[PDB]
Paper text:
[name] (OpB) is a two-domain, trypsin-like serine peptidase belonging to the S9 prolyloligopeptidase (POP) family. Two domains are linked by a hinge region that participates in the transition of the enzyme between two major states—closed and open—in which domains and residues of the catalytic triad are located close to each other and separated, respectively. In this study, we described for the first time the structures of bacterial OpB from S. proteomaculans (PSP) obtained by X-ray for an enzyme with a modified hinge region (PSPmod) and two of its derivatives. The enzymes were crystallized in the presence of spermine and adopted uncommon intermediate states in the crystal lattices.
Finally, the tobacco etch virus (TEV) protease digestion site (ENLYFQ*S) was introduced by site-directed mutagenesis instead of amino acids 71-77 (IPQQEHS), forming the first hinge peptide. The hinge region modification included the substitution of the functionally important residue Glu75, which, according to our previous homology modeling and molecular dynamics studies, participated in the putative interdomain SB network stabilizing PSP in the closed conformation. PSPmod was crystallized in a conformation characterized by a disruption of the catalytic triad together with a domain arrangement intermediate between open and closed states found in crystals of ligand-free and inhibitor-bound POP, respectively. In the PSPmod structure, the distances between Cα-atoms in the pairs Ser532–His652 and His652–Asp617 are equal to 18.2 and 10.6 Å, respectively, which are longer than those in the closed states of TbOpB and ApPEP and comparable with those in the open state of TbOpB and intermediate states of PfPEP and GmPEP. Gln619 was unable to form a SB with Arg151 and the latter interacted directly with catalytic Asp617, the interaction restricted His-loop movement and prevented rapprochement of His652 and Ser532 and consequent catalytic activation.
Residue numbers in the entry: 1 to 677
The structure:
């Protein structure tokens, strides 16, 4: 019916290694975001998306309403104790933001407000609480707040005794700060006013002019993120320096005045380590001897002195640890499962935390105090809503502290399976899927196949209440644990990045083909979704295997890969040479160009597709998906739906603009449900 927008073509040649690529839409990039022709094209496509999806308004309403009616209005966090006070977070209906309260641990009846997000947001356009921590003496509250939506945080201090605010503000910070043990001094991280990269650590005396703050440390390499931590012992504040590949920690004595940074272990390429300090020892998680990491104990910094507690193992990835009075507890991955193990400091007794679910995730939750036998850990499966447990590490007593509440939900209505697919190279790829039992008939059901598959991030199988809107309409929902993710440890990550990145896209296709072959879904109604680096996935897969999918949602997709990775002026490019590679090298130019979705768009039939992006703020810059859609409209040979939806907004809402997140999910789900009908 309707004529889609047609972007003007302006042939823009880019020549590298004597290869000339001609980019007809280079001009959709305006770093200033004011070119009126660039805004006209984005607004035109939004108007086309509006007009094309107008008939789905009723369905979007039904979806929105049933998603919001699943979740409670009142949320109360599980209370935790820290330094003799009990803390709870509270959301009332009508209140846009959290209220943070506390009481003395020995107290039940009365709670004091620490901070009311609604009060703090009064007469502001935007509010996000980035951080909240009371000093060790329980007398002062430090808060990191963002009033301007650019994740530059202001730090302010409140005297809890008389609820009065101090006069000063620490400006343009990462929101990362730590109290010295004097409850008078804080360390905090200043962003580079230009790059916005966290680069400087300062010491501040609370009450005083931030002019008098002392520069403690400045990071020289802008691939190294600067973070602050405080050891379980409270003896050290950690300056945590990391690239994607490489760590370095500096120690600040948290007890004494005029501390300067003390090197732990100098940075060495491809050595990642993190430390804690407890019971007069350093504990270190390090890949020095093995990609899957080991855990070491040491009296001092010197790497030569580190004693092996847990050796690196090819079949077990060591993800993190917590330290308690009598136990070490570690989070690991093995055979495609997250796992928790406990080891007694004295007896060396080992226990495994057991579950009975094919598709679940477990993790260490918040454990602020080490002098206890009570471990808090989280659990979620494709069929069991997210649960906090408290485990007695000595007695094995396991009590539920909180369950995610889901209305109109009967858990036994759904089934889940773990499936292993032999990929085209003989490698075994795990898959997690879930469906409604009473509407399942082999070879009949639409499939929704979700992937990410970059940075070693895992799509761990867990519960989603919004997913019930697809399951209750006959969909089989699949997580494809493709290479480039972390589900089978560091090797699974490395086998889907740099000169192996193609395995990511091949795994997604291999999984989809197998699931259809084995009768999990209807071959004519296979859908897929992926966002950001998962949008790169969507883009490569439709160029390579266009006929496999009926319809796609590609959120904020990374698709202009070669051109973006050739340009250091784009934020992220300098940090990502260790992910995709550096196309200033001909080997990486050729390898990346082979899959770069914008470059590999051809005159062939594509699936129906909804593409999303955002003008004002960017992980992926808005222009990549805009150029992608313009080029697809120019070359694609089919007559299927292609829509571009650009968020024009100023910024977000109550933390994650929850209203609006559900509206976006409803629009994407109506689009897929309309195609599956």
């Amino acid at each position: 019916h309707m004529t889609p927008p047609k972007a003007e073509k302006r042939p823009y040649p880019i020549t590298t290694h004597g290869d000339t690529r001609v980019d007809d839409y280079y001009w959709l990039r305006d770093d200033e975001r004011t070119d009126p022709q660039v805004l006209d094209y984005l607004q035109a496509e939004n108007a086309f998306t509006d007009a094309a999806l107008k008939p789905q308004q009723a369905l979007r309403e039904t979806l929105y309403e049933e998603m919001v009616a699943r979740e409670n209005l009142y949320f109360q966090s599980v209370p935790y104790v820290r330094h003799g006070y009990r803390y709870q977070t509270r959301f009332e209906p009508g209140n846009e933001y959290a209220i943070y309260v506390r009481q003395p641990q020995a107290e039940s009846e009365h709670w004091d407000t620490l901070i009311d997000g609604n009060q703090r947001a009064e007469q502001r356009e935007f509010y996000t609480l980035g951080g909240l921590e009371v000093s060790p003496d329980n007398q002062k509250l430090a808060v990191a707040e963002d009033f301007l939506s650019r994740r530059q945080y202001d730090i302010r201090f409140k005297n809890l005794s008389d609820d009065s605010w101090t006069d000063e503000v620490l400006e343009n910070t990462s929101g990362s700060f730590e109290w010295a043990n004097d409850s008078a001094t804080v360390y905090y991280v200043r962003k580079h006013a230009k790059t916005l990269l966290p680069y400087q650590v300062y010491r501040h005396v609370v009450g005083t002019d931030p002019q008098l703050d002392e520069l403690i440390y400045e990071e020289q390499d802008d691939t190294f993120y600067v973070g602050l931590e405080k050891t379980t012992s409270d003896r050290f504040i950690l300056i945590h320096l990391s690239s994607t590949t490489t760590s370095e920690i500096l120690l600040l004595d948290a007890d004494r005045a005029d501390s300067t940074p003390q090197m732990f272990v100098p940075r060495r390429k491809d050595h990642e380590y993190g430390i804690d300090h407890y019971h007069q020892h350093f504990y270190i998680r390090s890949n020095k001897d093995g990609k899957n990491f080991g855990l070491y104990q040491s009296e001092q910094a010197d790497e030569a002195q580190w004693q092996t507690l847990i050796a690196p193992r090819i079949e077990v990835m060591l993800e993190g640890f917590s330290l308690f009075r009598d136990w070490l507890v570690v989070e690991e991955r093995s055979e495609g499962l997250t796992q928790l193990r406990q080891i007694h400091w004295q007896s060396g007794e080992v226990k495994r935390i057991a579950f009975d679910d094919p598709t679940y995730t477990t993790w260490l939750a918040y454990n602020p105090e080490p002098e206890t036998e009570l471990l808090r850990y989280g659990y979620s499966s494709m069929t069991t809503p997210t649960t906090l447990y408290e485990l007695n590490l000595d007695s094995d007593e396991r009590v539920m502290l909180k369950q995610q509440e889901v209305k109109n939900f009967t858990p036994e209505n759904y089934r889940s399976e773990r499936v292993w697919v032999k990929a085209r190279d003989g490698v075994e790829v795990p898959v997690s899927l879930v469906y409604r039992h009473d509407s399942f008939a082999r070879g009949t059901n639409p499939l929704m196949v979700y992937g990410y598959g970059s940075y070693g991030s895992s799509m761990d199988p867990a519960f989603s209440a919004s997913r019930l809107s697809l399951l209750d309409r006959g969909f089989v929902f699949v997580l494809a644990h493709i290479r480039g993710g972390g589900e089978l440890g560091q090797l699974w990550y490395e086998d889907g990045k740099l000169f192996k990145k193609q395995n990511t896209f091949n795994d997604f296709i291999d999984v989809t083909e197998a699931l259809i072959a084995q009768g999990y879904g209807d071959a004519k109604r296979v859908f897929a979704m992926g966002g950001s680096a998962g949008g790169l996935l969507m883009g490569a897969v439709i160029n390579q295997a266009p006929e496999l999918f009926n319809g796609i949602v590609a959120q904020v997709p990374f698709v202009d890969v070669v051109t973006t990775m050739l340009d250091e002026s784009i934020p992220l490019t300098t940090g990502e040479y260790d992910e995709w590679g550096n196309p200033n090298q001909q080997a990486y130019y050729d390898y990346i160009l082979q899959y770069s979705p914008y470059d590999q768009v051809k005159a062939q039939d594509y699936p129906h597709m909804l593409v999303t992006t955002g003008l004002h703020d960017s992980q992926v810059q808005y222009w990549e998906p805009a150029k992608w859609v313009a080029k697809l409209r120019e070359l694609k040979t089919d007559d299927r739906q292609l829509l571009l939806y650009t968020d024009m907004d100023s910024g977000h809402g109550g933390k994650s603009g929850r209203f609006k997140a559900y509206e976006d999910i409803a629009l994407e789900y109506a689009f897929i449900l309309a195609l599956a009908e």
